[PDB]
Design a protein around this ligand. Structure first.
Ligand SMILES: [Zn+2]
Ligand SMILES: [Zn+2]
Lengths: 116, 49, 189
């Protein structure tokens, strides 16, 4: 995660192990620029995800006519005008929880009960 | 995103008599040039009247 | 050989609509503070747009493995876009969708007359287009042809013959040897 690019080379910095100072540096297999490892974690794989559950929530989601309105009150705004929609993770196993969006604070909440 | 949908009528088009003649007439027009050119060539090839 | 002349002028790029573009193929910059305006020569008081203030790595240059006469004139200081005043502008900018080409002049004549020239009209060429002897004197010239240029082709000899074709070609065939192929061919050498 969090790729790093070079400068004056701009390619992406692979990690090159420093054993002597004994830490991780990021090389640049084209121009020899280097720097540290801002964190020893290198790679993630992320089988079961929980992102895209709010894909493209723009400040205009309130301006889309086709989205179903709903009346519940935002925990923050305590306003009762909010559009909502299922989780945008277009995949089969996906749950059927609801993401609301208050038209006032643009705060996102959920209809959940298992985990908020 | 979901895979694409191939039957979505938004992505179809209907060729009416306009297009269908166009596609047809266009090729028939090349063939007319090509021949004209060939004749135009071959007559100049032999400086025929 | 290229020359960085000064390259320090604060050139200001402007994007403009077409009606402006056509008009440009004087001014009065009436900037005001940052609501920058400007007066154009008559026309309107079209203001400048702070379309892009900061503009780096962008410079103007002109010219006159082939080289040429390069000159680096000025640097972009800031990019602008035209602010069209808007009364007639929108009145014509919206009306920019009010043009097209013509339909077909479906030939108003009677049908009979027009086809007359198509068939056998028995007329043509109205548009000019793709319309397209002494054996002594012969030998004296043949010896001259042999002497002046042993590589004497028949055409160079026949044109130089300027006489009946018999005397030049036949009488000279004895003391002159003509090759058929190779460089010195057809040469009365
Ligand atoms: Zn680099
Ligand atoms: Zn709210």
């Amino acid at each position: 995660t969090t790729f790093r690019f070079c400068r004056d080379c701009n390619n992406m910095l692979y990690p090159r192990e420093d054993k002597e100072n004994n830490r991780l540096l990021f090389e640049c297999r084209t121009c020899s620029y280097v720097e540290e490892a801002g964190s020893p974690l290198v790679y993630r794989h992320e089988l079961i995800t929980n992102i895209g559950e709010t894909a493209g929530v723009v400040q205009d989601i309130g301006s889309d006519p086709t989205l179903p309105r709903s009346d519940r009150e935002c925990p923050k705004c305590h306003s009762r005008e909010n559009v909502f929609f299922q989780s945008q993770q277009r995949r089969k196993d996906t749950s059927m929880v609801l993401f609301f969006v208050c038209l006032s604070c643009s705060h996102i909440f959920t209809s959940d009960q298992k985990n908020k | 995103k979901d895979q694409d949908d191939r039957d979505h009528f938004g992505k179809k088009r209907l060729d009416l008599a306009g297009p269908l003649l166009a596609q047809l007439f266009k090729t028939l027009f090349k063939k007319l040039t090509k021949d004209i050119f060939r004749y135009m060539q071959r007559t100049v090839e032999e400086a025929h009247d | 050989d290229l020359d960085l002349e000064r390259s320090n002028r604060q050139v200001w790029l402007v994007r403009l609509p077409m009606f402006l573009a056509e008009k440009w193929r004087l001014g009065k910059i009436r900037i005001n503070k940052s609501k920058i305006t400007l007066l154009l020569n008559e026309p309107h008081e079209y203001d400048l747009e702070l379309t892009k203030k900061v503009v780096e790595n962008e410079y103007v240059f002109t010219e006159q493995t082939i080289p040429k006469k390069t000159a680096i004139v000025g640097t972009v200081c800031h990019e602008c876009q035209v602010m069209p005043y808007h009364k007639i502008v929108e009145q014509r900018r919206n009306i920019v969708k009010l043009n097209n080409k013509e339909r077909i002049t479906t030939l108003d004549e009677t049908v009979g007359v027009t086809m007359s020239h198509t068939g056998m009209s028995m007329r043509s060429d109205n548009s000019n287009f793709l319309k397209v002897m002494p054996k002594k004197e012969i030998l004296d010239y043949l010896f001259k042809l042999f002497d002046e240029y042993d590589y004497w082709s028949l055409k160079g000899l026949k044109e130089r013959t300027r006489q009946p074709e018999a005397h030049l070609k036949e009488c000279l065939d004895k003391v002159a040897t003509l090759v058929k192929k190779g460089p010195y061919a057809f040469k009365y050498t």
